Amino acid sequence: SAMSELDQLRQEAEQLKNQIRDARKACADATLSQITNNIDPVGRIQMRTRRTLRGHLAKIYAMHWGTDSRLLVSASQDGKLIIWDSYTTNKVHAIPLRSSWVMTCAYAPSGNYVACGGLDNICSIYNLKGNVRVSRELAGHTGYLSCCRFLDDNQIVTSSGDTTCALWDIETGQQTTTFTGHTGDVMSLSLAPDTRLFVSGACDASAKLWDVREGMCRQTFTGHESDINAICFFPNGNAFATGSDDATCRLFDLRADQELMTYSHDNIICGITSVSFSKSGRLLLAGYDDFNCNVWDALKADRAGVLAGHDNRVSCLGVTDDGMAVATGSWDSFLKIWN
Amino acid sequence: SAEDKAAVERSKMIDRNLREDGEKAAREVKLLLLGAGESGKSTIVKQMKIIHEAGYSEEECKQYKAVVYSNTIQSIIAIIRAMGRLKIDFGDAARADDARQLFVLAGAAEEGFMTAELAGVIKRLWKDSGVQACFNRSREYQLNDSAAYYLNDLDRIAQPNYIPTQQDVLRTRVKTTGIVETHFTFKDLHFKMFDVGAQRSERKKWIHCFEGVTAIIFCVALSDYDLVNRMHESMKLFDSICNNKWFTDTSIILFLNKKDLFEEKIKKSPLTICYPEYAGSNTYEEAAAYIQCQFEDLNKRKDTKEIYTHFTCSTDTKNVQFVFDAVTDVIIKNNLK
Amino acid sequence: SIAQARKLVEQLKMEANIDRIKVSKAAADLMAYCEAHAKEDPLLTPVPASENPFR
Numbered sequence: 001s002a003m004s005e006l007d008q009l010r011q012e013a014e015q016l017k018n019q020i021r022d023a024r025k026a027c028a029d030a031t032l033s034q035i036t037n038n039i040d041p042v043g044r045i046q047m048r049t050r051r052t053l054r055g056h057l058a059k060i061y062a063m064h065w066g067t068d069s070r071l072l073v074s075a076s077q078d079g080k081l082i083i084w085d086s087y088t089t090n091k092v093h094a095i096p097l098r099s100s101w102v103m104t105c106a107y108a109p110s111g112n113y114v115a116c117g118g119l120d121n122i123c124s125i126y127n128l129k130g131n132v133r134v135s136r137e138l139a140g141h142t143g144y145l146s147c148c149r150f151l152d153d154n155q156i157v158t159s160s161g162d163t164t165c166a167l168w169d170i171e172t173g174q175q176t177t178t179f180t181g182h183t184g185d186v187m188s189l190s191l192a193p194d195t196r197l198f199v200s201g202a203c204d205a206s207a208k209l210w211d212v213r214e215g216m217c218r219q220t221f222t223g224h225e226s227d228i229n230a231i232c233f234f235p236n237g238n239a240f241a242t243g244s245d246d247a248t249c250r251l252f253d254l255r256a257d258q259e260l261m262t263y264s265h266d267n268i269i270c271g272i273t274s275v276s277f278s279k280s281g282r283l284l285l286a287g288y289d290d291f292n293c294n295v296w297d298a299l300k301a302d303r304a305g306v307l308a309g310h311d312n313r314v315s316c317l318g319v320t321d322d323g324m325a326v327a328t329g330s331w332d333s334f335l336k337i338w339n
Numbered sequence: 340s341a342e343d344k345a346a347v348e349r350s351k352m353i354d355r356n357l358r359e360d361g362e363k364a365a366r367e368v369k370l371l372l373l374g375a376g377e378s379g380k381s382t383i384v385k386q387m388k389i390i391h392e393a394g395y396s397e398e399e400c401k402q403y404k405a406v407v408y409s410n411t412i413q414s415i416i417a418i419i420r421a422m423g424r425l426k427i428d429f430g431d432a433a434r435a436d437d438a439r440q441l442f443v444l445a446g447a448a449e450e451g452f453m454t455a456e457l458a459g460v461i462k463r464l465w466k467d468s469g470v471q472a473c474f475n476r477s478r479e480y481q482l483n484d485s486a487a488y489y490l491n492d493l494d495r496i497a498q499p500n501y502i503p504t505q506q507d508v509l510r511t512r513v514k515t516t517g518i519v520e521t522h523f524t525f526k527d528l529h530f531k532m533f534d535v536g537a538q539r540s541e542r543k544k545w546i547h548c549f550e551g552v553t554a555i556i557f558c559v560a561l562s563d564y565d566l567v568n569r570m571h572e573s574m575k576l577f578d579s580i581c582n583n584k585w586f587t588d589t590s591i592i593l594f595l596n597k598k599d600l601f602e603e604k605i606k607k608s609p610l611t612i613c614y615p616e617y618a619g620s621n622t623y624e625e626a627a628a629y630i631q632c633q634f635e636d637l638n639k640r641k642d643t644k645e646i647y648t649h650f651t652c653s654t655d656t657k658n659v660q661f662v663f664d665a666v667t668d669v670i671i672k673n674n675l676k
Numbered sequence: 677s678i679a680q681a682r683k684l685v686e687q688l689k690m691e692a693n694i695d696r697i698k699v700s701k702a703a704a705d706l707m708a709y710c711e712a713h714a715k716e717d718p719l720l721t722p723v724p725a726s727e728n729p730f731r
């Protein structure tokens with residue numbers, strides 16, 4: 001009898017899924033590649049290592065630029081957070097972590113704060129205003145902390161291996177809004193420019209758009225054949241790109257509620273650790289497990305370049321707000337600023 | 340290019356400090372505790388502190404006094420709850436009053452408080468023949484292995500001046516989601532032991548973070564064999580861990596734990612519960628070895644990797660001390676060059 | 677199984693009722709944004725080697 005009611009609910013779910021698939025197909029009159037055909041390709045633009053940041057003793061699992069397009073932070077499993085001056089390569093701060101296992105780091109837009117987290121299942125907030133000491137420790141995630149991003153100094157959104165994201169009130173130190181409905185580990189998150197929305201990558205091979213204020217999933221994006229390790233918003237906030245273990249990058253549109261484009265190349269089989277757009281959004285940068293970082297044309301779906309500075313897989317990427325510099329980080333313990 | 344040199348000087352100060360931390364970090368042996376919940380991982384970490392460090396002094400034990408009370412209460416409560424499911428009546432009908440008063444007094448504090456009133460209630464319940472009959476059926480529901488340990492010692496624990504012994508502290512049960520790290524020195528060697536604790540996720544994503552750690556201590560509870568299958572569930576996990584590509588150069592150490600329970604339990608519950616194809620006699624020695632074979636056969640690397648197996652009781656400071664001495668030797672022998 | 681099966685069905689309904697725009701319009705808007713800020717992109721536009729901090 002319980003099965004009979006479950007059979008109904010299954011059949012209804014199937015019907016609804018078919019409707020969405022059919023509604024999305026009705027939406028496609030044309031494709032992104034078709035409409036951009038007259039657009040002159042980027043070509044091949046060669047970049048170079050303009051800076052090499054040394055002093056990390058282990059794998060670098062994450063990094064985040066400052067909003068001033070100068071300072072940046074990095075998280076290594078050596079048990080250290082390091083704030084760098086990218087111009088002079090001077091180490092501004094070295095922050096000892098109570099847990100040497102750290103999978104992410106973030107830099108507050110005000111520049112007053114920095115966050116990090118990992119297998120300790122905690123997002124730790126460090127105050128940068130002599131030396132640096134921790135301000136807040138936000139607990140309650142039962143899974144590992146994969147990613148975190150500041151809305152402002154009082155608000156941060158985190159994602160975890162317990163399949164949930166969260167909105168935190170840092171002042172109270174309490175979780176404000178909990179985001180549920182992912183069936184797998186959430187590897188990454190990205191806020192919309194206006195911080196009205198944010199998207200999440202996960203091990204369920206799906207990306208999900210969440211409402212920050214009302215605390216709900218709006219849309220769900222699929223088509224990836226493996227885990228989504230990275231996610232990033234297109235500058236206008238109407239689109240986002242996803243990196244994955246299926247070796248592919250996928251551009252999704254919010255209004256169209258579907259996949260616009262796949263960025264992948266035969267002979268590229270390795271997983272993708274990180275993604276970032278350029279300032280205009282024309283260029284999509286992706287960190288790979290093959291030690292490289294490939295530069296894709298977002299509109300033309302062609303590779304505009306390649307970056308190999310690293311002897312180990314590239315774990316993370318970043319692009320300055322001014323779009324002047326590209327930062328890579330890796331398991332080879334080194335950071336490289338490209339221009 | 341003058342006044343900004345002061346910043347460069349601070350960078351070099353930082354740069355040297357990283358070098359200093361890095362030198363000392365390289366001489367530290369990194370151990371990784373794995374295995375299912377309640378396998379004894381938290382117990383062993385405590386033993387490392389007990390054996391190779393100062394251990395637990397009076398003040399350290401006093402911190403655990405609250406947890407001792409909590410574990411005791413949570414134990415007797417679990418039995419009472421099971422009495423309903425198994426249709427087991429109280430020996431004395433008046434014990435239903437204590438059972439209610441228990442749940443009421445269990446509500447008085449979110450921490451473990453212990454007063455004469457609560458002690459009398461738990462004691463009278465524990466002595467009751469109905470509760471004892473439900474206890475003997477504990478293989479049919481979730482219950483602490485330290486349950487009878489605390490409840491039989493209740494008269495001592497209920498004391499006003501009571502302080503926890505080191506055995507009391509070892510027996511306590513606590514669940515932490517966050518990874519637990521500890522440091523100690525043995526034979527001039529520095530150790531970092533890592534317990535993932537309760538990490539709720541798909542292990543595939545965080546497993547590579549531990550690539551290159553010296554050895555893995557995988558804890559398995561022998562007594563889980565007759566419980567609903569927890570043993571077969573452990574084998575699946577170990578099958579994944581031992582044969583993992585990330586652990587190739589990592590020494591795989593296998594602890595078969597709670598051997599004290601298993602030896603007594605095998606007198607009643609047959610191994611055929613867990614392994615129906617088992618045609619052997621039910622004896623502590625044969626059955627324990629059989630289980631060992633089941634876990635070791637899971638190795639697909641047999642020509643390359645070796646599984647170092649031990650039969651351990653983790654509450655026994657002496658037995659752990661002896662076995663860890665063998666663990667130390669394996670690390671030295673297996674990795675040196 | 678769990679009664680959460682109903683919640684998913686309801687979520688699918690929320691997934692189901694939404695405003696959906698034709699791709700070509702969404703695609704044009706992305707092109708429009710790119711071309712608008714194309715001159716402002718330092719990776720696309722080779723900013724003078726004099727002014728860039730890394731030289």
Ligand SMILES: Nc1nc2c(ncn2[C@@H]2O[C@H](COP(=O)(O)OP(=O)(O)O)[C@@H](O)[C@H]2O)c(=O)[nH]1
Pocket residue numbers: 374375376377378379380381382383484485509510511512513558596597598599600651652653654655
């Ligand atoms: N009877 C008995 N109990 C044990 C033994 N080893 C550990 N325990 C107890 O069993 C429980 C489970 O141990 P725990 O440290 O919590 O394991 P973990 O969940 O994997 O971290 C603890 O309460 C220990 O006190 C043993 O050899 N015999």
